[PDB]
Amino acid sequence: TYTTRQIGAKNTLEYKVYIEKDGKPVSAFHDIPLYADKENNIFNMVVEIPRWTNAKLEITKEETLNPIIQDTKKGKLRFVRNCFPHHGYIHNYGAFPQTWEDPNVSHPETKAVGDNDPIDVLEIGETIAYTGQVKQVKALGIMALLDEGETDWKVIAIDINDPLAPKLNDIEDVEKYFPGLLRATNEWFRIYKIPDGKPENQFAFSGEAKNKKYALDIIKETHDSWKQLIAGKSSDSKGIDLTNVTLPDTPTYSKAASDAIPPASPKADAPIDKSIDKWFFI
Amino acid sequence: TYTTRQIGAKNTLEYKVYIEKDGKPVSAFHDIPLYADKENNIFNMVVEIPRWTNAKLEITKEETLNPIIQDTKKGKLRFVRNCFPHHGYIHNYGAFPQTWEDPNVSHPETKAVGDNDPIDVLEIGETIAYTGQVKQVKALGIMALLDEGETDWKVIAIDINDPLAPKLNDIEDVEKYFPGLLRATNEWFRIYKIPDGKPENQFAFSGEAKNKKYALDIIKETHDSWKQLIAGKSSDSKGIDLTNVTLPDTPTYSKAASDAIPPASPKADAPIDKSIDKWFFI
Ligand SMILES: [Co+2]
Ligand SMILES: [Co+2]
Ligand SMILES: [Co+2]
Ligand SMILES: [Co+2]
Ligand SMILES: [Co+2]
Ligand SMILES: [Co+2]
């Protein structure tokens, strides 16, 4: 039974959100299982960023129990800018716990090393999610973004509770029920860092979304990368905190870690600089 | 200086926002001057609905001093739905005070009666506005929307404080600095009530955005209609409350109507039903 523990105010450097199980903090990266229902391929997705928000929140690989925090660049909080016709992120954006994009392996499909993080998930249902939420999704397909230098797969998924879930089984169903969303996804991921002064990104396979089956393989390749990583195996797993309070056959189990987390101390959201309102025409 | 007086929680039926001058309420329809700078055609815009919001907040024509109150449909709060690729309204949305789309005559450009409300304004600058804000804008152009069969011109304007204001002088400058915005504006107003079960609206002139000179002429016409209305000379003023505290030559002048308003009693924004999150693919 998953809930969240918030420390500080949203949109500040001190903001942190931990995932709790029956009231105690666990690691959002290694303690919540990849599958909610392995037999039916129902996954747990940890949500980082709600649709139509800008603050770039991310599970932190460098802190104990991997809380969700706001990304920073040279000390400054990171916000994605609004890129016309889009507002903020256009999906509920998160990742699957227990996955890793191996930074040491050149991918056959894409020709680039993995990005070193859990695999990214775009959840396309109607309801806006919340940071730190653990929701159950079905995988519909996958796109191969090359985020300047590296392979950064995006899984396309839908909350099993969405009113449309029963009718959405593979990537063609996204075209039918959410026409234009795959094109918008392609566009968004190509240009989202342009306002920040980075180049446009590119996609492998000329931007096509691969189907559910290709998606499930890739998902599996990343969770097996995750396996090597957590078991001490890895030419370079450096900088990642592996404490877990649920999973013993690894060196790094510590139930004391769950209790070393500060109690919740949620403050009202902090204001966001008015410049984040701006709509960029690029 | 104009400020606002809020009564209740936003997103509730009791919510009301009156505009005040010197800490005292005035009519948001009749008592804010159309022009902030007549010689330079600088106008006062009354903002009702901030960009990327959904609550259909409007100046209330039939209530004394015309506070902004959320519209209702069959008794329930009205929210415009999200129409993909858009999120709520895609402009800061409001009206010019002291204007009226006369509903008693057929307008020659559109061959349709007016919609009975102040002329509406789309403010395109980067800063998201707030409800009850009076800002000063320059008119750039105007589009001839026939909204559910009624003349419902949409003026295109920009806050004079926007960083780009000095570069925006006429309608072609909007395509230069905001490429795609006018086309998206035509699509938005065509489709936005389809999720409500209404037909697609249409535009006169094939949706063309006429220029500043054309816009000033239509704004003049709607100011001339309001002067007739406020003098008590319209053939049918539709039950509009004509109470005002600043126009002594009108029959409905009353400086004491200001004092009859309850004091401010703001509450925290109330939650919005999660159904309003939904993205509709038309
Ligand atoms: Co990620
Ligand atoms: Co990634
Ligand atoms: Co209306
Ligand atoms: Co209006
Ligand atoms: Co209308
Ligand atoms: Co109107």
Curated annotation (Swiss-Prot), chains A, B:
Sites of Phosphothreonine modification: 64, 250
Main location: cytoplasm
Chain sites annotated for binding diphosphate: 78
Binding-site list for Mg(2+) 1: 115, 120, 152
Compartments where located: Cytoplasm
Enzyme Commission (EC) number: 3.6.1.1
GO biological process, one term: phosphate-containing compound metabolic process
Cellular-component GO terms for this entry: cytoplasm; nucleus
GO MF: inorganic diphosphate phosphatase activity; magnesium ion binding
CDD domains, alphabetized: pyrophosphatase
Keyword Membrane assigned: no
Obligatory cofactor(s): Mg(2+)
Transmembrane segments: none
Listed PROSITE patterns: PPASE
Main EC class the enzyme belongs to: hydrolase
InterPro entries per UniProt: Pyrophosphatase, Pyrophosphatase_sf
Superkingdom of this protein's organism: Eukaryota
Keyword Transport: no
Cross-linked residues, Glycyl lysine isopeptide (Lys-Gly) (interchain with G-Cter in ubiquitin): 238, 278
Misc. comment: Present with 68400 molecules/cell in log phase SD medium.
Protein name per UniProt: Inorganic pyrophosphatase
